[PDB]
A paper describes a structure:
From these, a variant with a double mutation in the S1 subunit substituting Arg9 by Lys and Glu129 by Gly (PT-9K/129G) has been shown to completely abolish the toxic effects and has displayed the lowest enzymatic activity of the many variants generated. In addition, the space group between PTx and gdPT was the same with nearly identical cell dimensions and crystal packing interfaces. Despite the minor differences observed between gdPT and the previously reported PTx structural data, the double mutation (R9K/E129G) in the catalytic site of subunit S1 (the A-domain) does not appear to affect the overall folding of the protein. The incorporation of Lys in position 9 maintains the hydrogen bonding with Ser52; however, it induced substantial changes in the hydrogen bonding network. When examining the effect of the E129G substitution, all interactions at position 129 (His35, as well as the hydrogen bonding with Gln127) were lost. Since the crystal structure of gdPT did not show any differences in protein conformation, it can be inferred that the R9K and E129G mutations result in increased conformational flexibility in the catalytic core of the subunit. The rigidification of this mobile loop, along with increased flexibility in the catalytic cleft are predicted to impair NAD+ binding within the catalytic site.
One of the most important virulence factors of [name] and an obvious target for improving current aP vaccines is pertussis toxin (PTx). This exotoxin is a multimeric, 105 kDa protein, composed of five subunits arranged in a typical A–B structure. Ribosylation of these G proteins impairs the binding of G proteins to the G protein-coupled receptor, on the host cell membrane, promoting adenylate cyclase activity that causes an increase in the intracellular levels of cAMP.
Numbering used by the authors:
A (entry chain F), B (entry chain L): 2 to 99
C (entry chain I): 4 to 199
D (entry chain C), F (entry chain B): 3 to 199
E (entry chain H): 1 to 199
G (entry chain K), H (entry chain J), I (entry chain D), J (entry chain E): 1 to 110
K (entry chain G): 2 to 209, 222 to 235
L (entry chain A): 2 to 210, 221 to 235
The structure:
Amino acid sequence: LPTHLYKNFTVQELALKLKGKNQEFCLTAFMSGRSLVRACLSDAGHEHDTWFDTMLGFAISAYALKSRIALTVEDSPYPGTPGDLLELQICPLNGYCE
Amino acid sequence: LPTHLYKNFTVQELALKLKGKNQEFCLTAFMSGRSLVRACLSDAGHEHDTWFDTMLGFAISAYALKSRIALTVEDSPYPGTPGDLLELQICPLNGYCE
Amino acid sequence: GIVIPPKALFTQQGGAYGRCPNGTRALTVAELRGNAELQTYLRQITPGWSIYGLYDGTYLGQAYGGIIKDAPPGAGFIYRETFCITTIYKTGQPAADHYYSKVTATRLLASTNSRLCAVFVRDGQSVIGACASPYEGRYRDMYDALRRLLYMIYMSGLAVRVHVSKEEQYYDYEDATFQTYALTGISLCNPAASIC
Amino acid sequence: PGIVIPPKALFTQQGGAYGRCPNGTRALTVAELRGNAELQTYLRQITPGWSIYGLYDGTYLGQAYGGIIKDAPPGAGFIYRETFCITTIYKTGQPAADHYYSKVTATRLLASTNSRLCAVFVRDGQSVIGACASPYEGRYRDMYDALRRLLYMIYMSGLAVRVHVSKEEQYYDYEDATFQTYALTGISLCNPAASIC
Amino acid sequence: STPGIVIPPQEQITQHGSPYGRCANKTRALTVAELRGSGDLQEYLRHVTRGWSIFALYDGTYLGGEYGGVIKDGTPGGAFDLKTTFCIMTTRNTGQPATDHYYSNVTATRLLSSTNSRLCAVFVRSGQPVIGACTSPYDGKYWSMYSRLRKMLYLIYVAGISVRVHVSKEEQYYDYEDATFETYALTGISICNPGSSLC
Amino acid sequence: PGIVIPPQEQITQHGSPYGRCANKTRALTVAELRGSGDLQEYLRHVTRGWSIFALYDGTYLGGEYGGVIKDGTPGGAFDLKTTFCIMTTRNTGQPATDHYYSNVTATRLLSSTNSRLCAVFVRSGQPVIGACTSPYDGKYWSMYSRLRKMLYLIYVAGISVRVHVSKEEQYYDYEDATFETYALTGISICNPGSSLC
Amino acid sequence: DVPYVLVKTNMVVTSVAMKPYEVTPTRMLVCGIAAKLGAAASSPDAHVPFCFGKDLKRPGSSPMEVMLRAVFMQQRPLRMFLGPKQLTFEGKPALELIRMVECSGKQDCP
Amino acid sequence: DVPYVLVKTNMVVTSVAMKPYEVTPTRMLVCGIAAKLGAAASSPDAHVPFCFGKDLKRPGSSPMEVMLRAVFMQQRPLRMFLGPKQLTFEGKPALELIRMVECSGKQDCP
Amino acid sequence: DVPYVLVKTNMVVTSVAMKPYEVTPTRMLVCGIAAKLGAAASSPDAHVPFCFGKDLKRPGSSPMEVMLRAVFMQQRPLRMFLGPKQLTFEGKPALELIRMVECSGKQDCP
Amino acid sequence: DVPYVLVKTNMVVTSVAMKPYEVTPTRMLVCGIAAKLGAAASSPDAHVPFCFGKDLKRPGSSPMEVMLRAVFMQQRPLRMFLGPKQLTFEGKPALELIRMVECSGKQDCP
Amino acid sequence: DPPATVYKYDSRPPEDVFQNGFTAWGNNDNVLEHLTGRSCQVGSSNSAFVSTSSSRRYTEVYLEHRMQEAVEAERAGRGTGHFIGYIYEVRADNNFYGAASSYFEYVDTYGDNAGRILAGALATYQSGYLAHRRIPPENIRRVTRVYHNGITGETTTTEYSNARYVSQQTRANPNPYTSRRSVASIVGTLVRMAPVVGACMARQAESSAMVLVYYESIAYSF
Amino acid sequence: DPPATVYKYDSRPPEDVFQNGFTAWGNNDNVLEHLTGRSCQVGSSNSAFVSTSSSRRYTEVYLEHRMQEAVEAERAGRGTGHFIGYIYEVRADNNFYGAASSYFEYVDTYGDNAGRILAGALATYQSGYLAHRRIPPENIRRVTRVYHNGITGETTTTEYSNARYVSQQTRANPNPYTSRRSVASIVGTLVRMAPVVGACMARQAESSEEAMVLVYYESIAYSF
C-alpha cells in the first residue's frame, strides 16, 4: 500500500481500454529527464461510483488543457504493472504547482 | 275478365312508379284515328318471379325502337282504370303487324 | 379442313325424330366421314336393316354395308333415331390464356338450356369460336356479364381481342373450319393503348 | 437602480450559525432589509433585548437599542451566533407561461451546496434577467443535467442566446440584485436568419 | 370557396380518417367549401385535432391542432399523399315521411357511381340542377327497385328524354361534392304527356 | 472499390411506411441490393403483384415486374408505401480477441434514434475501419459513457490514435461502406512502441 | 305437335313477342314470326310462328333470348330447328324453337 | 399498387373490357382505357388503364357497370378516383376505379 | 407531421437549443437550425428547424447529442433524415431528426 | 474547524483537484487553490486551499463543480464563502467551500 | 389504297340518274353532323355529302332487306308486294372522301368528347365514302336493277350501262375531309333499324315517315 | 459607429513602441487563418495583421491575469514575482478592420462549413480590430505602464505620452477586410487559457527580452 506523489509532470499518453473483463483508463505523466509515471484506474468490481467516470473526465480535461499536473499513485501489488491513481490535480494554467 | 287485342299502335308514354307497397310500370299505346290504350303491369304477386323485369325490359325496348306494337290488354274490374298487360309484341321494324 | 368431333362425344341414346337432347346436336356426314374410329364403332352397334338420321344425311345399317348417304338439312329427321354428339369436350389442356387480336363477333348460335356462341372473324376469314353458358362450364358465373358485351360488339361490329380457355372444346357449329373454346374475356381494340 | 426585495415569508425561523446559513438559504443584506418595511416590523416583535444579529454586509441591533441596521464589510457580522438568512426559493403562484429574452449573454455564475446553479443574462452591458437550475429541487430539476451542459458552453463561448424562463418560481440567490431571477426552462442560440434574436 | 352548397351535417363525418386518400366504401372525401360552410364541423375538429397535424380534404387541406384550424385551397386529390383524409358518410336516414315528391320536365345528367354504393343522376331543367336522385342494389329501403330503375335511367340518359322524376325524402345522399341541389332516393321515372295520369 | 454487403439475415420481415425504417434499422441501398444475389433471390420469391418498393437511393420493381433495380436520389422514393430496411446489428459469433488499428483519426460521425454513435477511422485519407458505441444495446454498453468522452476529444482535436475493436458484433449503419464496422472497445493516445497502446 | 323436327333455312325473325305460359306459372314464352328470304307471300314459309320457353325462377337472359334480340335487330338469316312440340301464340299454333344458328353463306343456307 | 388515390379529371373512356379475376373465382374484372382531353399522345394520361371488381354471385349490372356503359357510349368527360390498388389487364398493371363522377364544367374539371 | 422522411444533404448546423417537451414531462427536446450549403437566403432549406427527444429518466449524453455538439462546433456538412413527425420549436413546427450522417464527399452529399 | 464563515473577495481559482473522502466512501472531494488578486506572495490570502463534497451515488456534475470548471478556465474573480468546516487536502487543512458568487464589479468586490 | 369504284343503293331509275346524277341536300359540310345523321333528318336535311359505299355487298344486303319489307307490307295489306331497287356503280375521284377517315380526323382535331364511338363504328362498318356537293352523270358507270314480285317470289336482275360515263384512271381522295367543330346539339348517332344503317345512307336512297333511332339507346340490351 | 480609439496589451516598453510602432509577422492576409490563430503559431507566424481591441477593459483583464501568473511563478519558485505590463492607446484609421465583421463576411462569401463557430464567438468577445501590415508610431497616443511587486503586493501605475504622435479626426474602417478562401488545414480555433484569449492577441504581446500553451477552443468549450 505505499503511495508516491509527483508534481509538474504533463499528460503525454491517455488510453481507455479493456483489461480482461474490467474497463481500465491509463495515463502517462512526463517530466524532462525523468522516467515516465504510468497510473491506471479500473472499474473493478465496481460498485456504483461515479469515481471512474469523474476521474476519467478530469484526466481528459488535464490532457486537453496541455497543463502541468500533480498526482498521487499507490503502488501496484504486481511488479512492472502501473500504479493506482488515487488523486489528480491540474496545476495553475500556464504555470506550475508549488 | 275480357281481353282486347290491339295492333299497329306506338308506345307514346312509359312510366315506372310505386303503387303503395308494390312497383308498377304503365304504358300508353297510340294510333292516329283511335283513343289512347293504357296498360299496366304490377310486381304485386311476382316477388319470386322475373315476369315484371322481363316485360319492363321488352316495353323499354319497344319504346326505344319507336316501332309499332301489338298488345293483349285484359279489362280492369274498375272503369276508367288502365287494363292489365298480358302480352306484348314488337311488330316488324319499319313495318306493320299483319 | 373441318374440325372432327372425337368418338367419345357420340350420344349412346340418340335424338328422337331429329330432337337431339339439350347439350347435343345432330352429327353431319362430313364429320362422320372424317372420323374412321367412329365409323368402326358404328358398324359394331348398328343392327341389320336399321336406317339412322343425321343433320345433312342418313346412315344405312350393317346389312347394307354401313352407307353414309347425303340428304338436305333435316331430311333424315323423319327416322326414329338421330345421331347426336355432346357439344362439350373436356380437353384436359392447361388453363392458360389464349387471345386473338383485331377480331369481330359474327354468326351467332343458341340452343335450349345450353350455350351462346359466336365466330370471331378477321379479314373475312374465321379465326376462332367462343361460347358462354349460365348452365354449365368453369366460366358459367361470367356468362351474365360476357353476354352484355358480346351483344354490344355483335351489334356495333367493333374490333375486339377475344380471350379463350382451351380447357373446354365446343362442337356446336356443324362442319366448322375453326376451333371453338370457352369465352373468358373480351377487350375492345385500342391501338394507342397497345390493344390490337 | 432599484433592487429586488425578498418577501417577508422567506425569512428563516432558525437562522444560520456563525455565518453558515443552511443549504437552500443565504445571508440577508442591509439594502434588502431596509427596503422591506413589513420584515422590519416583524423583526421588532421577535428580537429580544440586548441581542446582536449578523447579516452579509451588516449587523442588526436588538429592540433595546431601537432596531438598528448598521453597515459592515462582507462577512464581518458572521462573528455572531445567529445570522439572518432568507430561503432562496419562492413559489410565486404565477401562470406556468413561457417568457423569453433575446440577444442575451450568460455571465456572473452562482453556486451553493445542495442548491441551484445560477447565471445573469446580459444585453448591451446591462443585466436583463437571472436564471437558475438545480438537480435537487424545482419543477424543471430533471432538465438540469442537460441545461448545465449548454449553459457551460454559452458561458465559455460568450455566444448570444434567447433564454427561456418560467415565473412559477422566483429565486433570491443574488444579493442586492437589480434583476429578477426565475427557473431556467430553455436556451436557444441566436440565429437572425432563422428568426431567433 | 362557393357558398349556397349542401352542407353534410356533423353526424356524417367518420370517427377516424382514411389513409392513402382512400375513403372507405359508402363514404367520400370532405371538400374545402363544405368544411368552410360548416361551423359544426370546424368546431368539432378544433376540439379533437392535436399537434402540428395537416389533414387532407378532397380539394385542399385542414391545418389543425397547433395551427388553429386553417382551411387552405388546393386541387382535386392534390393532398391525398398525406397520412389522413377527412371522409363523410354518404347516407343519412332523414326520418321524413314516405310521401311522394316529384319534379316535372327534367333530364338526367352528370352520372355518379362508386364501389358497393348507389348510381346517381342530376335532374336538370333550363340548364340548372333541380334535384339529385340515386338508386342502389346494396342498401336502402328501395333496393328492389334498382334492377328496374337502372333500365329507365339508362334509356332517358342516353336519349336525353325529358321526364317526371319521383323521389323519397326518407334517405338523403351526400355523394355529390359541393352540390347546389339536394339528393334523395329515386322511386320513379315517367315518360309522359303534359297533364297525364301516368305521370 | 468494393462495398460491404449486409447478409440476407439483416433484412426485416416487413418493410416500413413513410420511408421511416424502425430504430436500430436503416434503408437498403441500390448498390447493396445489386451486389447481393441472396437478397435479390429472396425478394423475387416473397414479392407479389405490381408492387414497387423504396430503397434509400432508388427503387425495387418486384412481383410481376420481375425484380428490376432502378437508380434514384437519396430519399427520392420515400413517398412510396413500403421501404426496404436492414437491421444494423449482427452477432458475428467471432471470438472476443483484441483487434487494433494504429495511426488512425476519427472522422465521418453517425448517430440515430435509440441506437449508436459511430466513427470512420482513417489513415492517409482512406478509411481503415468503422467503430461504434452505444448505451442502449451490445456487450460493451457500459463502455459508452467512457468511450464517448475519448471519441469527442480525438474527433474535435484531430488526434491520431490506436483504435481497439471487438469483432463479436458487426454493424451496417453506414450506407455503401468500403470498410467493415465493429464494436468500439478502446482508444489510445500513445507514443510509438508504447505498452499503453 | 308436328311428327319431326323441321330445319328451315334463310329465315329472318320479322317480329318478336312475350306472353305467359298456360300450363306452367313459373315459366313464360318468348315468341316471334320467321320469314324465308325470297319466298312467295302465299307460301307458308313466308310466315312461320315460333315460341321458346323462359324460366321465370332464374334471373337473366337465356342464350336464345340474347341471340333472338340480336338477329331480330340486325335481320340476320338463320337455320331454325323447329318442333316437334307446338305451343300457343295469338290463339294459333306455333312451333317450338329448340336451336338456331346464323347463316354463314350459300353452303349452309341454300 | 400505387401509394395514394389519383384524381384524374377530364377523362373520356375510350375502350371497355371484361376478364376473370385471378385471386377470387366468385368475382370478375370490368376493365377499360381512359384518355385525358387535350393531352399529348406521348403522355401517360392519354391512355390510362383501369379495372373494377364485379361480384359474380350477385345477378345484374352494378352502378359502376351501368355508368361505364353510358359514359363510354356518350364519350362524357369524368373525374376518376384511381388506386391505390393495381389489378392486371392485358398482362400490364391497371389502377383500381373506386369512384367516378361526370364533369359539370371547368370548376370541377379544370 | 409531414407525409414522408426527408433526406437533406450538405446541411451545416448553424445553431443549437434545449427546451422542455410539452406532451411528456419525463422527456425533453434537443433542437437546432440546419442550413444547406450554397442555398439562397430566401430558400426554406437555408434555415431548417429540427428537434430530437432526450430521455430525462436516463443520465448522460445520447449518441445524437454527442454528434450534434461535435458537428456544430466543427461546422461539418451532414446528411439529415427528418420527419415524418413534427415537434414545436420557438412557437413554429420543427422536423424530427431521426438519423444523421456526416458528408464524405460528392457521392453521399451531391 | 475555523470558528466562523470567511468571506474572501476578488479570489481566483488557480488550481483544481480531485481526491477521495476519508470518512465516507460514497462521497469524494473536489478541491482547489484560491488566490486574492493583487495580494502579496507572503500574505495568507495568496494561497487559500479549499474543498467541497461530491456525492458519488448521484450521476453527473453538481452546480459547484460546473461553476468551478468555468471560473477556473476563465480565471473569474469570486466571492468565496469558506468554512467553518475544514477538510484534508495535500496533507494540510483546507476550508470547506459552501457558496461562491462571481464578482460583478468594485462595489461587491473591493 | 383508296378505291377507284364506290357503290350506291337508290330508288331513283337510271333514266333520271344517268342524265342528272346525285346532288347533296345542302351546303352543311360538317363531318360529325353527317356521320351522326343530324344533317339528314326530315326538315333538317342540309348535308353537303352524298353517301356511297366501297363495299357492293353492303349495298346488296340493304337492297335485300328493303325487298323483304315490301313482301312484309303485302302480307299486312299495305302494298302490292312489288319492289324495284337499284345499285349504281360509281367511279370515285378526289371529290370522294373516306367517312371513317374523316370521322377519326375530326376526333383527333376536337377531342374524344366531341365525337360518338358508334358514329365511328358505323362509318367503318358501312365502308362509307362521302362525295362533296355532287356526283356528275359522267362518273356513274353501271346500274344493277333488281325487280321482285312479292306474290310469286320471282327476282329479276338486269344490268344497264351509261353512255354519258367518262373513263378515267381516278380513285377516291387519300386524305380525309376536314370541317369546323359542330356547334349543334348532338344526342347520338341516328340509325335506321333492321339492319342497322346510317341515317344519311338510308334517307338519300328514299324518294317520293322513316323511323330513325339513336344507336346508343339500342347498342346494349335492356 | 466605428471606434476612433483601439487598445493593445504588450510586453515591449514605450522607448521601443513610441519609435518603432507595431509590425505584422508577414504577408498572410487570410482572415480565417488569423482568427483561428493558425498564422500566429510558433514556426508558422506570417499573419499580415496586428491585433488590437476596441475595449480597454479586455486588455486590462489580460494584463491583470498575466500579473497574477508572475505571482504564481514566484510561489512555485520559478520567478522573482516582478511584472511589467503595457496598455497602448492607439488612434484607429481606415487601415484598422473589425475582426468579427471580417469573419462573418468570410463565412457569407465561402459558406458555413468554411468557418468555425468559436472563431466568430472569440472575435466578438475580444472586440478585436486588425490593423493591416503596420501600426506606425504616429498613431500610438499614450501608454499605461503597470508595475507589480509580487513579494509586497504593490502595484504602480504610470502614464506616458508619445511625442511622435500625430492627431487626426480618423476612425476604424467601417467595411470588413476581405481575403481569398483558406486552402490551409484548420482543425480549430487556437486559444491561450486562463482567461480564454485568441492565439494572435496573446502571441503578439509576448516578447523575449517556456513556450506558450495553445489549445483548440472546440476541445474545451463543452465539459467532459
